[PDB]
Amino acid sequence: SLSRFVETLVVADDKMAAFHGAGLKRYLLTVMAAAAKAFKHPSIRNPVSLVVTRLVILGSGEEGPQVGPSAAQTLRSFCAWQRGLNTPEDSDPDHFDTAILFTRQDLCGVSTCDTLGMADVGTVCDPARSCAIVEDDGLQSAFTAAHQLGHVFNMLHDNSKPCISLNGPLSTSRHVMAPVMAHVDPEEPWSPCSARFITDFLDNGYGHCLLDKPEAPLHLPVTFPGKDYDADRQCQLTFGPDSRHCPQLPPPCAALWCSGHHAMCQTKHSPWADGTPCGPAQACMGGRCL
Ligand SMILES: [Ca+2]
Numbered sequence: 001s002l003s004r005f006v007e008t009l010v011v012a013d014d015k016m017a018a019f020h021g022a023g024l025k026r027y028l029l030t031v032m033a034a035a036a037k038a039f040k041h042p043s044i045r046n047p048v049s050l051v052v053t054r055l056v057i058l059g060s061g062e063e064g065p066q067v068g069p070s071a072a073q074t075l076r077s078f079c080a081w082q083r084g085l086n087t088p089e090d091s092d093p094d095h096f097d098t099a100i101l102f103t104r105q106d107l108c109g110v111s112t113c114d115t116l117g118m119a120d121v122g123t124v125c126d127p128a129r130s131c132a133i134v135e136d137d138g139l140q141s142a143f144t145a146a147h148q149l150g151h152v153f154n155m156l157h158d159n160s161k162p163c164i165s166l167n168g169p170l171s172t173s174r175h176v177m178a179p180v181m182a183h184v185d186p187e188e189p190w191s192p193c194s195a196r197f198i199t200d201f202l203d204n205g206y207g208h209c210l211l212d213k214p215e216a217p218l219h220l221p222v223t224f225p226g227k228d229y230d231a232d233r234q235c236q237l238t239f240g241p242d243s244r245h246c247p248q249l250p251p252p253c254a255a256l257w258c259s260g261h262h263a264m265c266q267t268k269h270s271p272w273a274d275g276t277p278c279g280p281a282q283a284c285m286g287g288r289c290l
């Protein structure tokens with residue numbers, strides 16, 4: 001089976017910078033790594049290799065895309081912007097196959113949105129339309145990412161009419177292309193339905209532009225995200241610099257609860273990052289302490 005490469009542009013926005021500071025590039029790489037690990041899983045049934053060839057960080061001095069107010073607007077804004085950066089032929093190292101915008105603007109509290117982001121379906125090799133938006137809110141934005149790129153590869157939600165047929169009645173929502181905020185089974189990240197829709201896409205020659213290998217991609221961390229950022233840090237990434245992990249809430253791994261201000265524990269209900277210590281000889285995998 002012919003091996004694919006997705007030459008990804010990554011764009012961090014004006015507010016993503018304020019939030020992450022110097023820690024940004026590393027953060028963004030840690031997330032992208034994590035998305036890339038999902039596309040590399042045998043469950044997708046295709047040798048797809050997610051790869052960052054460019055990374056751009058804006059100001060505040062750098063006239064970027066007009067992000068906000070909505071998610072639908074942000075995507076049309078981004079996709080028109082991102083083109084001024086691309087090149088005519090996939091022969092120039094600067095040519096990228098798809099683009100992703102991470103923003104820390106609350107779009108999904110003012111506007112409708114897919115998970116915490118948006119994308120069109122089946123666009124991988126259309127430079128005018130191959131692009132995505134993700135609202136960042138922690139390491140788990142690596143799955144928001146994959147879900148949106150999934151759509152880029154012509155995937156649909158696992159609760160659509162076509163997907164019920166293929167996944168079977170006893171299907172769970174523990175996969176990347178589930179319409180809810182996901183808790184992806186890492187033994188089986190992609191469902192049968194997602195596995196098929198991509199196969200058909202690539203087989204019908206829609207991934208013709210993913211065949212060239214980029215000469216110099218950015219290095220992606222090979223350590224777990226829970227080792228790179230501990231529980232407190234992960235909490236800090238979701239909610240703010242003052243947020244500490246509330247470990248006391250059972251079961252370990254299933255939900256990252258973080259402190260806030262009397263005093264409280266809050267949650268976005270997305271698991272602890274994979275490889276967070278949760279026991280003496282234990283770390284978390286897919287929201288469980290194994
Ligand atoms: Ca190229």
Ligand SMILES: [Ca+2]
Pocket residue numbers: 005007090096097209210211212
């Ligand atoms: Ca390419």
Ligand SMILES: [Zn+2]
Pocket residue numbers: 114115147151157179
């Ligand atoms: Zn979706």
